[PDB]
Ligand binder design. Structure first.
Ligand SMILES: CNC(=O)c1cc(C(=O)N[C@H]2CC[C@H](O)CC2)n([C@@H](C)c2ccccc2)n1
Length: 110
């Protein structure tokens, strides 16, 4: 449980690392709908999520288990797939970062 949350923290550090920055950068901070002119974003996305919020929740010991952590990371990707045209670069970037996430999450010590 501690060990599983350390694995989750390792994944989070990797998703925020320079290695993945080319496709991870749209997920670093909350979507600023107003700044991007996406005035329908908060009508379509009821539960915004981003890696800075995941990092705050990890630092605050909000996550009680790996499943709660994974739920937030996957919510972040789901929001991207729900809102954006499926042929837009941001969806390709989501797919690439979710591939990194899912393959390493699958190696959870258990
Ligand atoms: C998690 N972030 C997102 O969901 C998101 C959505 C967007 C965005 O601007 N989406 C538009 C693109 C034009 C289209 O006609 C409507 C939707 N962006 C910006 C930062 C973006 C990311 C990647 C490359 C260009 C622009 N991040």
């Amino acid at each position: 449980l501690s060990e599983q949350l350390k694995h989750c923290n390792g994944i989070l550090k990797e998703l925020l690392s320079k290695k993945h920055a080319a496709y991870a950068w749209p997920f670093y901070k909350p979507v600023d709908a107003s700044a991007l002119g996406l005035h329908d974003y908060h009508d379509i996305i009821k539960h915004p999520m981003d890696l800075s919020t995941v990092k705050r929740k990890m630092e605050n010991r909000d996550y009680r288990d790996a499943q709660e952590f994974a739920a937030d990371v996957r919510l972040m990707f789901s929001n991207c797939y729900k809102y954006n045209p499926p042929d837009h670069d941001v969806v390709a970037m989501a797919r690439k970062l979710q591939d990194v996430f899912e393959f390493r999450y699958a190696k959870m010590p258990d």
